[PDB]
Amino acid sequence: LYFQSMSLQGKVALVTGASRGIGQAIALELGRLGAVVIGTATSASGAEKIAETLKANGVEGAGLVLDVSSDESVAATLEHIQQHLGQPLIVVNNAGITVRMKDDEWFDVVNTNLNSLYRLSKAVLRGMTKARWGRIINIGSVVGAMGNAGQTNYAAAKAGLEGFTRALAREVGSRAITVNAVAPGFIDTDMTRELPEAQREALLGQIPLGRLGQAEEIAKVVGFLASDGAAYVTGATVPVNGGMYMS
Amino acid sequence: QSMSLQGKVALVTGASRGIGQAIALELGRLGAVVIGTATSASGAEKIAETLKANGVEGAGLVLDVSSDESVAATLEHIQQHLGQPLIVVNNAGRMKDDEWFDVVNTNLNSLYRLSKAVLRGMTKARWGRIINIGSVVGAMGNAGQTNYAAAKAGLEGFTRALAREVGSRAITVNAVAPGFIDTDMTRELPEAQREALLGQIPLGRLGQAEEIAKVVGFLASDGAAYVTGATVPVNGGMYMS
Amino acid sequence: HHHHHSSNLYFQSMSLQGKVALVTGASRGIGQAIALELGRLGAVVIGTATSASGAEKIAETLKANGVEGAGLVLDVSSDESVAATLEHIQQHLGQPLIVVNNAGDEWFDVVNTNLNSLYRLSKAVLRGMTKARWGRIINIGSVVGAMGNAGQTNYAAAKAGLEGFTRALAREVGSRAITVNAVAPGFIDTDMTRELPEAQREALLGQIPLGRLGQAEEIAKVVGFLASDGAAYVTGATVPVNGGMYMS
Amino acid sequence: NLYFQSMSLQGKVALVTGASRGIGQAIALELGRLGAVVIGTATSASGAEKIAETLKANGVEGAGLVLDVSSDESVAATLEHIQQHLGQPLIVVNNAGITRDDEWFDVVNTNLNSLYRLSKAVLRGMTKARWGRIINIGSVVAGQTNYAAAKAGLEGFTRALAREVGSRAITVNAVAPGFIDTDMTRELPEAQREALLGQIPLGRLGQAEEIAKVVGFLASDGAAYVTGATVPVNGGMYMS
Ligand SMILES: Cn1cc(C(=O)Nc2ccccc2)c2ccccc21
Ligand SMILES: Cn1cc(C(=O)Nc2ccccc2)c2ccccc21
């Protein structure tokens, strides 16, 4: 057998929302570390793009279609993964939010997200319980709109993510399964490049590092949490925001 | 890897035993040149021997973080003989019910003093990593919970404030808050106290010194460059404050 | 089976000027005490329970303490129950401008069900508060709730949800001069906690700096303050009322 | 019975530091209104005089004294003078700030040393009476850094002291104001003011009196199970 810091050789990782941005970068980073990676999207064209992306970077795995809002989609996708690859022991929940946004959208957004986390988490626990090992990692939503509406939704989503992460970690810990979260700040993605320049330039002034974070910078934190060295880290939400904190 | 610290000098205080030692070895494993410190000459010597015995380049020196003179002189010695430390880990630190105030105040004064003195070099290089290690859980009574919570709160606020001050310079400042770790202090707490702490830990075990160190090594890496002002708890799911 | 039961001295505590307050889960403990304290402060109080016999007990309790108001049946998990009860209250007493939500594997569903209840009831009373350009919504957390190990998970989760929810709703409705706050009780003196054996009780007390259980009345005074004009700049806050015992 | 309970402060001596203007003044008047005998303090003789005049003009019994909370000598002597002439202060509100002009660290360190000094000195009297209220007022809203740091220290300190003294039926709490209408905030340019307002859900500045009502509640018998808490009074604007 092998035994190395940071290596995920021989593990199957499931990464939801893997077709663009943060999710893509997470998939490639777990690939780089030796995991067999199943990335998912909500559509066939995204699943295809994921597979192509993985192949082009020499990562074994697949792209599949998964709707985390559906008990059926989740059970079937898991069974398919079990049949063809094995039990995913590393699961990164990144699949999230589907006029501009307002300060009254928080409730639904957060409720729908945590129902999805719970559903998928619950379904992969059986396999992690059997192996007496696991990593669940929840990715929070990026800071996405500049005003009060945007600050409200972001803070609410971060708060739910934290409480949920901490509670699940407490339930499953006795089985040597860690549950953590990563809370990104202002990241360079498709959403943030197409904010108007006034809203965007205002955000830089609130960030001590004086830059946007990169998708890869979220992914390195996730890859660490997945490793054997982060085994005593559980129930934590690691903020990755260049020093700007808004709750 | 990209976890690599090849070509960097790291200073790790309180490096002669437990968590500090394990931090020194882990930064060594990652390729840093490591200066570990203790409060006595024999500890400095033990550090050097420990580093040699694990194939890590660096040294052991004597440092009293409570003293402005000790700090200035040690830094100047490090500057003369090996270069500017761009990774600095502050680890050097029954209980009493009124001891909290002085304990915390003394710790944060030590953090500030040492941090301030190494900033000049990090500012020049336009790069740095400062990592603050909180106190391990173990203290017996209500007194012990009080001191732990107070020390964690101070550590967090301090870490966050310093991170804001120095961030424009691409220096990150973070903290690691250990829970119940297997060390010299904990390995013979009475069994009732130990069992009680286990029962509050979801993972159902003590953490290892190495498990704190891996977190520190990650924070020091280029891949943790957007993490700053954070206190990362490393406690197996046991949260108390 | 009746589901609506109603009930020249001028006490100086009466600064609530006949305002109508709705207090869910008002038949026992903390909820009862909140109902009486808002009564003492001069509000017209509608306390609710899930059954007709509870609604009756509420009305009897209010009458026996000289508080105007009623006991009604309300199921906060039901859109129909909430819409109908509110309309009944509107028709017979007026718009409730003070609303205290106290009616409350396991960990997940408990918190999710609770916050859905808070949201439902809160959303339904907002129209009337918006019209009056004044309101107070106060959310009562899970009493401990959780004693040793497995329970504490449920308590911390419920507190985290309560706090984030409270803070978000407060941001949404603030421009209308409606405050939204929460009160997070620690270990409160009830039937359950009095009948613990002395060893278990002494151990619990040793975790509480004040060295005693809190009283129901002591939660209620906080709620009554938050409902007042003087707490008008307090919004989005969760006020812990736990004698110094903080469980993270 | 139900109706006559009151959480008035009749028969208690309250000490309020920094009482000559704004928040501190309004605290002094609110504890006066509630029936306490109030000693307000300032760092100068002219402030102590203004305090006494203010109290007299609102029919509140008490005094204005000079107190420098950064000085062990000033604290001991003032307390002894209060003990001799009025009685043991059992309600103590720490509102007096201290400036250093690396600011972030020294400001917070100087403040908490003040809180600790004064708190320690008034504990003997509260211990003797087996009753007390200590209330710590945070700073009103680089600037975000100093505010967050000062708030974090205030919280941890408040919580630790509360644990130490609780067995004696003394509560220790804090009030963290957001953007309040005071002398400092009445001179902001409109762009900076509008920006702050747009971050405040209530859409207005808080009043001094609104901080004071929270303090007066915490001082009452009905807040007796509230300890170790920091109550934010910021109209829904939370800076972490
Ligand atoms: C709908 N919703 C759920 C929130 C939430 O935090 N839920 C939660 C917490 C802990 C454990 C399990 C669930 C939550 C938080 C803020 C706003 C809305 C929320
Ligand atoms: C003496 N003391 C200082 C505490 C503390 O929080 N200091 C601090 C905070 C932020 C920045 C700089 C300094 C602190 C916290 C809890 C208990 C005691 C404390």
Short mmCIF file of N, CA, C and O in Angstrom, two decimals, chain D residues 56-113:
data_model
loop_
_atom_site.label_atom_id
_atom_site.label_comp_id
_atom_site.label_asym_id
_atom_site.label_seq_id
_atom_site.Cartn_x
_atom_site.Cartn_y
_atom_site.Cartn_z
N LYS D 56 -28.78 68.00 38.04
CA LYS D 56 -29.66 68.90 38.82
C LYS D 56 -30.84 69.35 37.98
O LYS D 56 -31.99 69.30 38.41
N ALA D 57 -30.55 69.80 36.76
CA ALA D 57 -31.59 70.31 35.86
C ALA D 57 -32.65 69.28 35.47
O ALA D 57 -33.64 69.65 34.87
N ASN D 58 -32.37 67.99 35.67
CA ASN D 58 -33.32 66.92 35.36
C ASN D 58 -33.78 66.21 36.61
O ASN D 58 -34.31 65.10 36.54
N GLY D 59 -33.53 66.83 37.76
CA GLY D 59 -33.98 66.32 39.05
C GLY D 59 -33.45 64.95 39.42
O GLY D 59 -34.18 64.10 39.90
N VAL D 60 -32.17 64.72 39.16
CA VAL D 60 -31.52 63.46 39.46
C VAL D 60 -30.51 63.71 40.54
O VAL D 60 -29.65 64.59 40.40
N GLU D 61 -30.60 62.95 41.62
CA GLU D 61 -29.64 63.02 42.71
C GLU D 61 -28.35 62.34 42.33
O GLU D 61 -28.37 61.34 41.58
N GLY D 62 -27.23 62.93 42.75
CA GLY D 62 -25.93 62.35 42.43
C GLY D 62 -24.78 63.32 42.50
O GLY D 62 -24.83 64.26 43.28
N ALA D 63 -23.78 63.12 41.63
CA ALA D 63 -22.69 64.08 41.45
C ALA D 63 -21.97 63.92 40.13
O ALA D 63 -22.17 62.96 39.39
N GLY D 64 -21.10 64.89 39.84
CA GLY D 64 -20.14 64.81 38.74
C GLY D 64 -18.77 64.86 39.36
O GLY D 64 -18.48 65.74 40.14
N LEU D 65 -17.92 63.89 39.02
CA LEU D 65 -16.57 63.85 39.54
C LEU D 65 -15.57 63.67 38.42
O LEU D 65 -15.92 63.27 37.34
N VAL D 66 -14.30 63.91 38.75
CA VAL D 66 -13.23 63.77 37.82
C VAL D 66 -12.62 62.42 38.04
O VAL D 66 -12.35 62.01 39.18
N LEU D 67 -12.44 61.69 36.95
CA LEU D 67 -11.96 60.33 37.01
C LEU D 67 -11.19 60.08 35.74
O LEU D 67 -11.70 60.33 34.65
N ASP D 68 -9.97 59.60 35.89
CA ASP D 68 -9.15 59.14 34.78
C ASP D 68 -9.03 57.62 34.93
O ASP D 68 -8.32 57.11 35.82
N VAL D 69 -9.74 56.88 34.08
CA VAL D 69 -9.81 55.41 34.23
C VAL D 69 -8.49 54.73 33.87
O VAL D 69 -8.33 53.56 34.17
N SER D 70 -7.58 55.45 33.23
CA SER D 70 -6.23 54.92 32.93
C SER D 70 -5.28 54.93 34.13
O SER D 70 -4.19 54.35 34.06
N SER D 71 -5.71 55.51 35.25
CA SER D 71 -4.85 55.69 36.41
C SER D 71 -5.35 54.96 37.65
O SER D 71 -6.43 55.27 38.17
N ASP D 72 -4.53 54.04 38.17
CA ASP D 72 -4.83 53.33 39.42
C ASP D 72 -5.11 54.25 40.58
O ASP D 72 -6.01 53.99 41.39
N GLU D 73 -4.34 55.33 40.67
CA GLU D 73 -4.50 56.33 41.74
C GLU D 73 -5.84 57.06 41.61
O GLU D 73 -6.61 57.17 42.59
N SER D 74 -6.13 57.55 40.41
CA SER D 74 -7.39 58.24 40.19
C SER D 74 -8.59 57.33 40.56
O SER D 74 -9.51 57.78 41.24
N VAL D 75 -8.55 56.07 40.12
CA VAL D 75 -9.63 55.11 40.38
C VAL D 75 -9.82 54.83 41.87
O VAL D 75 -10.94 54.87 42.37
N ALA D 76 -8.74 54.51 42.57
CA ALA D 76 -8.84 54.22 44.01
C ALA D 76 -9.40 55.39 44.78
O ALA D 76 -10.28 55.22 45.63
N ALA D 77 -8.92 56.59 44.46
CA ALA D 77 -9.30 57.79 45.21
C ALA D 77 -10.73 58.19 44.93
O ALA D 77 -11.50 58.52 45.83
N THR D 78 -11.11 58.14 43.66
CA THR D 78 -12.49 58.42 43.29
C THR D 78 -13.43 57.42 43.99
O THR D 78 -14.44 57.81 44.56
N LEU D 79 -13.12 56.14 43.94
CA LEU D 79 -13.99 55.15 44.57
C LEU D 79 -14.13 55.43 46.07
O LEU D 79 -15.24 55.41 46.60
N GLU D 80 -13.01 55.71 46.73
CA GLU D 80 -13.05 55.99 48.17
C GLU D 80 -13.90 57.22 48.48
O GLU D 80 -14.71 57.22 49.39
N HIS D 81 -13.73 58.25 47.67
CA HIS D 81 -14.52 59.46 47.77
C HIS D 81 -16.04 59.15 47.59
O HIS D 81 -16.88 59.56 48.39
N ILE D 82 -16.39 58.33 46.60
CA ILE D 82 -17.77 57.88 46.41
C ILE D 82 -18.26 57.07 47.60
O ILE D 82 -19.38 57.26 48.06
N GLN D 83 -17.43 56.17 48.12
CA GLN D 83 -17.81 55.36 49.29
C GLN D 83 -18.09 56.22 50.51
O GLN D 83 -19.10 56.03 51.19
N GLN D 84 -17.21 57.17 50.76
CA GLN D 84 -17.36 58.09 51.88
C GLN D 84 -18.64 58.90 51.81
O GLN D 84 -19.34 59.02 52.80
N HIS D 85 -18.94 59.47 50.64
CA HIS D 85 -19.97 60.51 50.53
C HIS D 85 -21.33 60.06 49.99
O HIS D 85 -22.33 60.74 50.23
N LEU D 86 -21.38 58.92 49.28
CA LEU D 86 -22.65 58.45 48.70
C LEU D 86 -23.01 57.00 48.94
O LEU D 86 -24.19 56.67 49.11
N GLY D 87 -22.01 56.13 48.92
CA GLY D 87 -22.23 54.71 49.11
C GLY D 87 -21.54 53.93 48.02
O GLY D 87 -20.91 54.49 47.15
N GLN D 88 -21.68 52.62 48.08
CA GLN D 88 -21.05 51.70 47.16
C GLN D 88 -21.79 51.73 45.82
O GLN D 88 -22.97 51.47 45.78
N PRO D 89 -21.09 52.03 44.72
CA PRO D 89 -21.79 51.94 43.45
C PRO D 89 -22.01 50.49 43.06
O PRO D 89 -21.06 49.76 42.91
N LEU D 90 -23.26 50.10 42.88
CA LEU D 90 -23.59 48.72 42.51
C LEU D 90 -23.98 48.59 41.05
O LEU D 90 -24.18 47.48 40.57
N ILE D 91 -24.12 49.72 40.36
CA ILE D 91 -24.30 49.74 38.91
C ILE D 91 -23.16 50.58 38.36
O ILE D 91 -22.98 51.73 38.72
N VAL D 92 -22.36 49.96 37.49
CA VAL D 92 -21.20 50.62 36.93
C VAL D 92 -21.25 50.43 35.44
O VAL D 92 -21.26 49.29 34.95
N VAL D 93 -21.27 51.56 34.74
CA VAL D 93 -21.29 51.61 33.30
C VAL D 93 -19.97 52.21 32.80
O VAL D 93 -19.67 53.36 33.04
N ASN D 94 -19.16 51.41 32.12
CA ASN D 94 -17.89 51.87 31.56
C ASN D 94 -18.12 52.40 30.19
O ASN D 94 -18.38 51.66 29.26
N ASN D 95 -18.01 53.70 30.05
CA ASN D 95 -18.20 54.35 28.77
C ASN D 95 -16.99 55.17 28.34
O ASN D 95 -16.80 55.41 27.16
N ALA D 96 -16.18 55.62 29.31
CA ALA D 96 -14.94 56.38 29.05
C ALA D 96 -13.95 55.66 28.14
O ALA D 96 -13.45 54.60 28.49
N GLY D 97 -13.67 56.25 26.97
CA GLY D 97 -12.65 55.70 26.05
C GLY D 97 -11.28 56.28 26.36
O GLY D 97 -11.11 57.14 27.24
N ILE D 98 -10.30 55.74 25.66
CA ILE D 98 -8.93 56.22 25.71
C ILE D 98 -8.29 56.11 24.32
O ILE D 98 -8.40 55.07 23.67
N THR D 99 -7.62 57.17 23.88
CA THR D 99 -7.02 57.24 22.54
C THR D 99 -5.51 56.92 22.59
O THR D 99 -4.85 57.23 23.57
N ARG D 100 -4.98 56.22 21.58
CA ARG D 100 -3.54 56.17 21.34
C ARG D 100 -3.35 56.68 19.93
O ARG D 100 -4.10 56.30 19.05
N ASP D 101 -2.35 57.53 19.71
CA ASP D 101 -2.15 58.15 18.41
C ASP D 101 -0.68 58.45 18.18
O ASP D 101 -0.28 58.82 17.08
N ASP D 102 -0.51 50.64 13.96
CA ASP D 102 -0.34 50.13 15.32
C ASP D 102 -1.36 50.70 16.33
O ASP D 102 -1.35 50.36 17.51
N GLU D 103 -2.26 51.54 15.85
CA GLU D 103 -3.27 52.10 16.72
C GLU D 103 -4.18 51.00 17.19
O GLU D 103 -4.50 50.91 18.35
N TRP D 104 -4.60 50.16 16.25
CA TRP D 104 -5.59 49.14 16.54
C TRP D 104 -5.25 48.36 17.80
O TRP D 104 -6.11 48.21 18.68
N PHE D 105 -3.99 47.94 17.92
CA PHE D 105 -3.59 47.11 19.06
C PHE D 105 -3.64 47.87 20.36
O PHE D 105 -4.26 47.42 21.30
N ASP D 106 -2.97 49.01 20.42
CA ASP D 106 -2.87 49.82 21.66
C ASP D 106 -4.22 50.37 22.13
O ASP D 106 -4.51 50.34 23.30
N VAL D 107 -5.06 50.82 21.20
CA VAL D 107 -6.40 51.27 21.55
C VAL D 107 -7.12 50.20 22.35
O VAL D 107 -7.65 50.48 23.41
N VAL D 108 -7.18 48.99 21.81
CA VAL D 108 -7.98 47.92 22.42
C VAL D 108 -7.34 47.49 23.73
O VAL D 108 -8.01 47.34 24.75
N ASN D 109 -6.03 47.35 23.71
CA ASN D 109 -5.27 47.01 24.93
C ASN D 109 -5.41 48.03 26.07
O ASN D 109 -5.60 47.67 27.23
N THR D 110 -5.36 49.30 25.72
CA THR D 110 -5.60 50.37 26.68
C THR D 110 -7.06 50.34 27.19
O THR D 110 -7.30 50.48 28.39
N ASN D 111 -8.02 50.16 26.29
CA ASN D 111 -9.41 50.09 26.74
C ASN D 111 -9.66 48.96 27.74
O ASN D 111 -10.29 49.18 28.76
N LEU D 112 -9.18 47.75 27.43
CA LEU D 112 -9.49 46.59 28.27
C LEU D 112 -8.76 46.66 29.58
O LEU D 112 -9.28 46.21 30.59
N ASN D 113 -7.58 47.27 29.59
CA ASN D 113 -6.90 47.56 30.86
C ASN D 113 -7.72 48.51 31.72
O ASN D 113 -7.80 48.32 32.92
#
